[PDB]
Ligand binder design. Structure first.
Ligand code: CLA
Ligand code: CLA
Ligand code: CLA
Ligand code: CLA
Ligand code: CLA
Ligand code: CLA
Ligand code: CLA
Ligand code: CLA
Ligand code: CLA
Ligand SMILES: CC1=C(C/C=C(\C)CCC[C@H](C)CCC[C@H](C)CCCC(C)C)C(=O)c2ccccc2C1=O
Ligand code: SF4
Ligand code: SF4
Lengths: 141, 737, 139, 68, 38, 80, 82, 39, 30
């Protein structure tokens, strides 16, 4: 239940720090906005917010939402890269547009890269995502 | 035509200085010696074992003899928390008056060294009281070392040289090593504990004169045979017991409280004796497992060949042929046995380091902080050495002892079949730890530097804190399986729990320390270090036989420089690159974890734990509050205004810096520059007058490529341990000294 | 035999023969040229190929063939008529580089198979087969 | 079945393109050990250090191949 | 400086023996061993 | 002395002999190649081990292969 | 921040300075198979940095990390005591 | 016509991508600063 | 503390592994 971690509003070390939060942007009340926004976290004896990473809810915003957001964005980047790499193979001049990127193909790969997990599941169930161990270069033992 | 080296004739006709350097380094590689058979190989290794055990026993005899002779074991047992233990005296012709005055310490009238190995606590705990009991132990260890030397000399004589079948008798060796080396020795240590150590902790002197007269229990050996063994746990030691004297003492020789002694802050000696008797019984039982001569038992080959999941099993034939081909692969190859031995020894040395700080077994050793620091760092660095050597000998086994015909489609062959899937996934987990550990450290550094430490990503290690709460810590409020008193584990017959629970829930010990956001990141740094060192080591062990750039890597052996600048460039491709590049990563990982241990324990011992708890989340707090802050009394060991007792530690600090930086010369600058330099020096010698009379017998050449990688590695390593041992010992001895 | 040759006009350098040339072995290169030109010694600096036939001494065979490569390539008269000898301090001379009289890159009858394996390099024995013997897996 | 232009997979373990598919440039009909010249899309490691070029063809035997 | 321990004159003999005398002996003997022919 | 071993995957391109700086290698006639010649290493006692021959070999793995063995005064390439 | 950054770059230099090309070529060979498994083979084949380029990267990182460290130390000392 | 091929090279496009990504992150941390976690 | 004679006794005891280490090292050489 994390009795050692108190909420930052009830913690009497966070309230001493929260007066002297510096402004980060040009907004004059940015320190006060940070102070009110970090009060819902858990603070230790230092008076600083802590993040609990075990997938629980009311602390899913620490890791689960940023983690799923990164997984979507990184899957977007990797899937668009893999799609471009596959698309530039079977047209007999691949190093030149590996080094000088074909922009009209890359734009069509990028803007249609939002549906990366559906295409990933389709290629996984279709077997066209993973190359079989026979048709692949392997170093000598 | 030079008699050195005798064992190698390729190096004997070497006309250069490489002959001496390579005769030094190939002296113990008996497998590549000229005219060496397996039958002579095993016997030479057997005799070298006896010589090495004699070296160990002579080193122990010298340690005990220097405690007895020029140490203070009489004065230290009176006040173990105030008197500094003396290792040995200093006789230096180079001392001035300032160094003699500074090193006249610990109540001595002579320049003496303060002991930081902490064998004083060990001797006081095991039953040593005066200097004569140490002197008789030193003399007995001298006799034991002479006995081992005579055994090693005897087993080189042709009458007593064992046959090859005796050396490869695995079943008998395992039986006598589990029953006798592990079980009889633990039973004998139980006998010493209940006969000497436990009564000497209770003020009853025993010695060699009274152990046949002083009976260890009031009911001596009568409850052992009847069966009512609880009589040996009827009257345990009171919490008001004072060590080394009879007030507050109990009478039971096998208690089972599981806590700490309230005075010495260590485990009970009766607990230690009960643990040793339990593991001696289990080790003797495990020693009665393999068949030797009497029909009953086990054969290892049948166990290995029967261990393969058949068809219809949910895993199926996933292991291929299973383990057939083992017990020939392992027993024929000495490097397989050596790698397994070094891996097991490195793991149990890591366990020794992680257990002697949290569960001290020696009297008043928890309150001698510098002894704890030296012991933890000393055992963890040796554990890293043993683990890297285990993987190095796995690489040696693959390059010169692995037979693909005998190991056909077994587990060992199928490791090599997907040998780079392991390397790719281990690279992935190394990058996954490294990018994000450095990202969180750099993020914390930047936001703390920008005046906003509340923008740090502070992560509470809830899994390890759940483990702490499951072991009985009520501080985190998990109420899980020992933290609440109404669990199925807590309401059991576990009678270790009244001692263990108030041993773990008291903050006066090192048992299950408070961990926070500064412990999460360092643990992931540690995981990065082990995963990356494993990546270099697995990568070089599995690519030892050959790979895509160099298919015939087994023809050149384990240790070769390169394969020329062709094929793109081939520097560090031998399986020796794994060892060479993983010594750096092992030393970096051990530096990370020993900095962790030292800074956390300095915060604990000083009483200000908040410094680590707020400053270890960013690397500038590490760099300032641990390195710069604790090097202050170190570097002031000698100043223009005088000399402290830490002047030798400041000198070792600078010495380690010098050796570590001299290693950079061998690691960065490479051979042909130095060969071109030595050619000019050779010209200058042969063309000057009055010095061309002096002619070299061997032609001076530069150090070879592998030799200089090894020399720079040895300099890096020796400088690393010397400067960190100096910093550690002076940092926690200038405060707690 | 006896090496009839005159030395190129060289000013003397420090990269030439050391003490081991008169005690272990030294090497010589003799070459005939129909014109006078300037060449670079592996010793260091530049010297003069005088008209006619030339004899130079070096401490290594590699210095002699580094000179012979400079005699073959990078010269317009295209000197190939060079011979390389080894002189031991006893006095024995061994004729080394154009043994058949033809350069080694050109095939010639009368040369036998040295170091030739009638097997693929991947089809080599494992070292575990050849344990505790003098034989190494490339034999 | 080995003819010029046929895509073929290498069975030499030590080759750079072991279990990789390349085209056949020429097959020699005289009695030589490695008559099948095979050219690949990728390039070998061969060359000096820093060289941006490498070889992409080699001779192979009949038993060192399989037709796809 | 002599110590209060028993036989304090033994550091004054053994330390120059093990630090100066026998390393000179060992380097001389090993030099003759590693540099002798045949 | 080093061991320069020439294997049967040799195309007879003579690049190893022209790349050799100490005349270790030469060409011998050979019926097993299209070029009609294979490399041989008669005076391999002069091999320093520079592996320029291994650099110039155009085979997928090198038909000429240098094994660094015992070190002599010619393998070290010492002018002194 | 620049003091710690220069310490990082000085330590980062020694990976290129101490190691050699043939380790990293084999490690990249292990990564190429994992890319080949998921149809991620690049057209431009990944090679390790050449030996001269490995030395150049190591010495450039060494000089950069040391010089940035000394710049940061000098300037922060002299902007506080001067 | 040859200029668009130069702008389609790897360094120019990776620089444009990194400047666009850094600008997007900087414009996000200006308008919505100090987001340690999702509320 | 130990006596002065005990140090010389331990030294001449230590000559027994002193000789036997020399005997093992020469036979390990052979
Ligand atoms: C390996 C164990 C060990 C080590 C590290 C030390 C180290 C030390 N001893 Mg020694 N010593 C030891 C064993 C050990 N001793 C034992 C078993 C005895 C016999 C009971 C003594 C008796 C002794 C005396 C009487 C004196 C010392 C002293 C010394 C100091 C300087 C060395 C010297 O001049 O005397 C070395 C003299 C000897 C007689 C030692 C003989 C060799 C011993 C038996 C062990 C052999 C060493 C090793 C195993 C073999 C070489 C290994 C190689 C790979 C390095 C130093 C602190 C001196 C001192 O206190 O100065 C302040 C001194 O005068 N020692
Ligand atoms: C299409 C691009 C792409 C894809 C999807 C992959 C995917 C993979 N790589 Mg990676 N990688 C790539 C490019 C790519 N990588 C490049 C450019 C480098 C050189 C820096 C590497 C070097 C590399 C290493 C060293 C490792 C991986 C690993 C892996 C695996 C785990 C993911 C990971 O660790 O990310 C790590 C990613 C990086 C370190 C760099 C990625 C750089 C960007 C994000 C790639 C995409 C942008 C691309 C340049 C342009 C897209 C094309 C566009 C014009 C449409 C996974 C199979 C690991 C593995 O084997 O696990 C099994 C492994 O150890 N990769
Ligand atoms: C019961 C009879 C017996 C016993 C006691 C021994 C004893 C031993 N044998 Mg042996 N062996 C025997 C019969 C026996 N063997 C039989 C019959 C065979 C024939 C098949 C062999 C064949 C054989 C071989 C071929 C070899 C040995 C070797 C050895 C030595 C092992 C190395 C060593 O000293 O580590 C001792 C280590 C320990 C006691 C501790 C082990 C690690 C512990 C369990 C971890 C925990 C430590 C614990 C915390 C205590 C800490 C200490 C303290 C400071 C706190 C040891 C002296 C080697 C040798 O020659 O040595 C000279 C070797 O080469 N033996
Ligand atoms: C291998 C180890 C070992 C050995 C050599 C000894 C040796 C001995 N024990 Mg024992 N002891 C040990 C293990 C050991 N003990 C352990 C494991 C326990 C705990 C259960 C005990 C508990 C114990 C008691 C309770 C007594 C003995 C006694 C004895 C003595 C019986 C022989 C005699 O003449 O009387 C003898 C000195 C007896 C004794 O000291 O009487 C003289 C006695 O009564 N022992
Ligand atoms: C139980 C411990 C153990 C044992 C039995 C050995 C045994 C062996 N090792 Mg070693 N090894 C181990 C642990 C072990 N190792 C550890 C801890 C490391 C990691 C640091 C390694 C790393 C290692 C490598 C990678 C290699 C071996 C090899 C060797 C073999 C010959 C030793 C040698 O080169 O001559 C003796 C070596 C020297 C004299 C070099 C100097 C070593 C230090 C600097 C001297 C310190 C002396 C000091 C004053 C006391 C031999 C089979 C070699 C091999 O390939 O053989 C098959 C080799 O190249 N070892
Ligand atoms: C501080 C210095 C430093 C750093 C950060 C690196 C970095 C790394 N080493 Mg290491 N290494 C070093 C010193 C260092 N090493 C030295 C001194 C040696 C001893 C010779 C080695 C030798 C060594 C070996 C031989 C191996 C590594 C490996 C690696 C990787 C481990 C994975 C990891 O941590 O995630 C990645 C972490 C990083 C910090 C990557 C750097 C990203 C930067 C910070 C981004 C900068 C962007 C900026 C805008 C420009 C990584 C690239 C292993 C590897 O590459 O396998 C995958 C490998 O096998 N290293
Ligand atoms: C593969 C990377 C990696 C590895 C090697 C480790 C290693 C470590 N973790 Mg773990 N951990 C990681 C990733 C990893 N972690 C991540 C992604 C999270 C979530 C943020 C955590 C959160 C976590 C906490 C809360 C704690 C540990 C702790 C520890 C230690 C004990 C083992 C344990 O609890 O494992 C936990 C193992 C996992 C969570 C598996 C993660 C592997 C997956 C595949 C990563 C991808 C998942 C994706 C992000 C969703 C050990 C040093 C303890 C510690 O610091 O001790 C003081 C501790 O209590 N870890
Ligand atoms: C570990 C062994 C050790 C020992 C016991 C000594 C002993 C000594 N050192 Mg030395 N030294 C050593 C190692 C050691 N050194 C090493 C490793 C270094 C290199 C870093 C140095 C660096 C060093 C310097 C540079 C100087 C000393 C000097 C001294 C002397 C200081 C005494 C004094 O106040 O002046 C009194 C001096 C004397 C009474 C002169 C003693 C000369 C003796 C009696 C001659 C013996 C003759 C003998 C037969 C031949 C040598 C032994 C033979 C077996 C080879 C003393 C003799 C100083 C000195 O005086 O030089 C001699 C000095 O200048 N040392
Ligand atoms: C690699 C590890 C890593 C991790 C986990 C983080 C994570 C974080 N950093 Mg960062 N940081 C790192 C390394 C890292 N950083 C390093 C290397 C530096 C030094 C250069 C910094 C310096 C730094 C500062 C100075 C700041 C952060 C802040 C942030 C936070 C939010 C940033 C943001 O704009 O989110 C919001 C972004 C989004 C919501 C994404 C929206 C757009 C996406 C791409 C499209 C989504 C489409 C669907 C977050 C906690 C900021 C903060 O709030 O501090 C707590 C902040 O001010 N970081
Ligand atoms: C890590 C390492 C490699 C591998 C290094 C590689 C494969 C380089 C990877 C390319 C990186 C990602 C380039 C990044 C640096 C850029 C110059 C910075 C700008 C890049 C923009 C995208 C920002 C070697 O090849 C090597 C060779 C010889 C000795 C030591 C080493 C060595 O240590
Ligand atoms: S290693 Fe050098 S000297 Fe030896 S054969 Fe090859 S090219 Fe010639
Ligand atoms: S370089 Fe290689 S392929 Fe060419 S002739 Fe020499 S051995 Fe044959």
């Amino acid at each position: 239940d994390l009795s050692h971690l108190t909420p930052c509003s009830e913690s009497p070390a966070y309230q001493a720090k929260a007066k002297s939060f510096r402004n980060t942007t040009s907004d004059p009340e940015s320190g006060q906005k940070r102070a009110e926004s970090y009060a819902e976290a858990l603070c230790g004896p230092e008076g600083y917010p802590h993040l609990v990473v075990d997938g629980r809810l009311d602390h899913a915003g620490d890791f689960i939402i940023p983690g799923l957001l990164f997984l979507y964005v990184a899957g977007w980047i990797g899937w668009v890269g893999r799609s471009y790499l596959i698309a530039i193979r079977e047209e007999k001049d691949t190093e030149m547009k590996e080094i000088i990127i074909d922009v009209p193909l890359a734009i069509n790969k990028m803007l249609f890269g939002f549906m990366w997990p559906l295409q990933a599941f389709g290629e996984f169930t279709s077997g066209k995502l993973t190359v079989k161990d026979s048709e692949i270069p392997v170093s000598p033992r | 035509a030079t008699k050195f080296p005798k064992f190698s004739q390729d190096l004997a006709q070497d006309p250069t200085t490489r002959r001496i350097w390579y005769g030094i380094a190939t002296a113990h590689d008996f497998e590549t010696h000229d005219g060496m058979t397996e039958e002579n190989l095993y016997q030479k290794i057997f005799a070298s074992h006896f010589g090495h055990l004699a070296i160990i026993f002579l080193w122990t005899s010298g340690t005990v003899f220097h405690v007895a002779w020029q140490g203070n074991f009489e004065q230290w047992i009176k006040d173990p928390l105030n008197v500094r233990p003396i290792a040995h005296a200093i006789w230096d012709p180079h001392f001035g008056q300032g160094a003699v005055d500074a090193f006249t310490q610990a109540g001595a009238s002579s320049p003496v060294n303060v002991a930081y190995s902490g064998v004083y606590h060990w001797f006081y705990t095991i039953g040593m009281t005066n200097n004569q009991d140490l002197y008789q132990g030193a003399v007995f260890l001298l006799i034991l070392s002479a006995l081992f030397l005579f055994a090693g000399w005897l087993h080189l004589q042709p009458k007593f040289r064992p046959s090859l079948s005796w050396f490869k008798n695995a079943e008998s060796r395992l039986n006598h090593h589990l029953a006798g080396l592990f079980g009889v020795s633990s039973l004998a240590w139980t006998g010493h504990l209940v006969h000497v150590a436990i009564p000497e902790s209770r003020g009853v002197h025993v010695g060699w004169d009274n152990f046949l007269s002083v009976k260890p229990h009031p009911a001596g050996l009568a409850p052992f045979f009847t069966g009512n063994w609880g009589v040996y746990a009827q009257n345990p030691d009171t919490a008001s017991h004072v060590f080394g004297t009879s007030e507050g003492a109990g009478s039971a020789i096998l208690t089972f409280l599981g806590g700490f002694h309230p005075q010495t802050e260590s485990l009970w000696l009766t607990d230690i004796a009960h643990h040793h008797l339990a593991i001696a019984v289990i080790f003797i039982v495990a020693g009665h497992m393999y068949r030797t001569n009497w029909g009953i038992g086990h054969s290892i080959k049948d166990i290995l060949a029967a261990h393969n999941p058949p068809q219809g099993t949910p895993f199926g034939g996933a292991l291929g042929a299973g383990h057939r081909g083992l017990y020939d692969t392992i027993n024929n190859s000495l490097h397989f046995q050596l790698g397994l031995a070094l891996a097991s020894l490195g793991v149990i040395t890591s366990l020794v380091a992680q257990h002697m700080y949290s569960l001290p077994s020696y009297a008043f050793i928890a309150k001698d902080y510098t002894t704890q620091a030296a012991l933890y760092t000393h055992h963890q660095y040796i554990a890293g050495f043993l683990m890297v050597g285990a993987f190095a000998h796995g690489a040696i086994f693959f390059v010169r002892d692995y037979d693909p015909e005998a190991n056909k489609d077994n587990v060992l062959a199928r490791m090599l079949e997907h040998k780079e899937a392991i390397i790719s996934h281990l690279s992935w987990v190394s990058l996954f730890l490294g990018f994000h550990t450095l990202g969180l450290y750099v993020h914390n550094d930047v936001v703390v530097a920008f005046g906003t430490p509340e923008k740090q990503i502070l992560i509470e290690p809830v899994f390890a804190q759940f483990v702490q709460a499951a072991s009985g810590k009520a501080l985190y409020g998990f109420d899980a399986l020992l933290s609440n008193p109404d669990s199925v584990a807590s309401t059991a017959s576990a009678v270790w729990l009244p001692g263990w629970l108030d041993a773990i829930n008291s903050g006066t010990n090192s048992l299950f320390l408070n961990i926070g956001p500064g412990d999460f990141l360092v643990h992931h740094a540690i995981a990065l270090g082990l995963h990356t060192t494993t990546l270099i080591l697995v990568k070089g062990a599995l690519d030892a036989r050959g790979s895509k750039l160099m298919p015939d890597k087994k023809d050149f052996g384990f240790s070769f420089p390169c394969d020329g600048p062709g094929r793109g460039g081939t520097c560090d491709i031998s399986a020796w690159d794994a060892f060479y590049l993983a010594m750096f990563w092992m030393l970096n990982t051990l530096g990370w974890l020993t900095f962790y241990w030292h800074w956390k324990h300095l915060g604990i011992w000083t009483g200000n734990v908040a410094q680590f708890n707020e400053n270890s989340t960013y690397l500038m707090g590490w760099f300032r509050d641990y390195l710069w802050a604790n090097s202050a009394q170190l570097i002031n060991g000698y100043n223009p205004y005088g000399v402290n007792n830490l002047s030798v530690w400041a000198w070792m600090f600078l010495f380690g810096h010098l050796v570590w930086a001299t290693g950079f010369m061998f690691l960065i600058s490479w051979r042909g520059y130095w060969q071109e330099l030595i050619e000019t020096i050779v010209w200058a010698h042969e063309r000057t007058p009055l010095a061309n009379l002096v002619r070299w017998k061997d032609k001076p050449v530069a150090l070879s490529i592998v030799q200089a990688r090894l020399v720079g590695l040895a300099h890096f390593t020796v400088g690393y341990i010397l400067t960190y041992a100096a910093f550690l010992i002076a940092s926690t001895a200038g405060k707690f000294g | 035999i006896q090496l009839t040759g005159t030395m190129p006009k060289f000013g003397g350098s420090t990269g030439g023969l050391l003490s081991a040339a008169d005690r272990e072995e030294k090497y010589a290169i003799t070459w005939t040229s129909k014109t006078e030109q300037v060449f670079e010694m592996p010793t260091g600096g530049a010297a003069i190929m005088n008209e006619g036939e030339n004899l130079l001494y070096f401490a290594r065979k590699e210095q002699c063939l580094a000179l012979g490569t400079q005699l073959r390539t990078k010269f317009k008269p295209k000197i190939e008529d060079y011979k390389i000898y080894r002189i031991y301090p006893t006095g024995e001379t061994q004729y080394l580089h154009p043994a058949d009289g033809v350069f080694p890159e050109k095939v010639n009858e009368g040369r036998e198979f040295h170091g030739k394996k009638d097997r693929n390099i991947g089809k080599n024995p494992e070292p575990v087969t050849l344990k505790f013997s003098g034989k190494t897996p490339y034999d | 079945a080995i003819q010029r232009g046929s895509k073929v997979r290498i069975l030499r373990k030590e080759s750079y393109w072991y279990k990789d598919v390349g085209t056949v440039a020429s097959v020699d009909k005289s009695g030589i050990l490695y008559p099948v010249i095979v050219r690949f899309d990728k390039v070998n490691y061969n060359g000096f250090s820093g060289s941006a070029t490498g070889v992409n063809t080699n001779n192979f035997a009949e038993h060192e191949l399989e037709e796809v | 400086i002599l110590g209060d321990f028993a036989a304090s004159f033994l550091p004054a003999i053994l330390v120059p023996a093990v630090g100066l005398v026998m390393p000179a002996v060992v380097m001389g003997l090993l030099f003759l061993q590693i540099e002798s022919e045949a | 002395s080093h061991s320069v071993k020439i294997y049967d995957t040799c195309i007879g391109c003579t690049q190893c002999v022209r790349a050799c700086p100490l005349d270790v290698l030469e060409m011998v006639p050979w019926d097993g190649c299209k070029a009609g010649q294979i490399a041989s290493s008669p005076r391999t006692e002069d091999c320093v081990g520079c592996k320029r021959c291994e650099t110039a070999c155009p085979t997928d793995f090198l038909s000429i292969r240098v094994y660094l063995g015992a070190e002599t005064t010619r393998s070290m390439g010492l002018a002194y | 921040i620049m003091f710690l950054a220069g310490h990082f770059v000085f330590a980062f230099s020694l990976m290129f300075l101490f190691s050699g090309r043939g380790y990293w070529q084999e490690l990249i060979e292990s990564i190429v198979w994992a890319h080949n498994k998921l149809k991620l083979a690049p057209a431009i084949q990944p090679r390790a940095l050449s030996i001269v380029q490995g030395r150049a990267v190591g010495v450039a990182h060494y000089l950069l990390g040391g010089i940035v460290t000394t710049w940061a130390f000098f300037l922060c000392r002299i902007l506080s005591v001067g | 016509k040859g200029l668009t091929t130069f702008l389609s090279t790897a360094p120019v496009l990776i620089t444009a991508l990194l400047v666009f990504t850094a600008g997007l992150l900087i414009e996000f941390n200006r308008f919505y600063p100090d987001l340690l976690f999702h509320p | 503390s130990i006596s002065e004679t005990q140090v010389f006794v331990a030294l001449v005891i230590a000559l027994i592994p002193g000789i036997l280490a020399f005997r093992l090292a020469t036979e390990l050489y052979k």
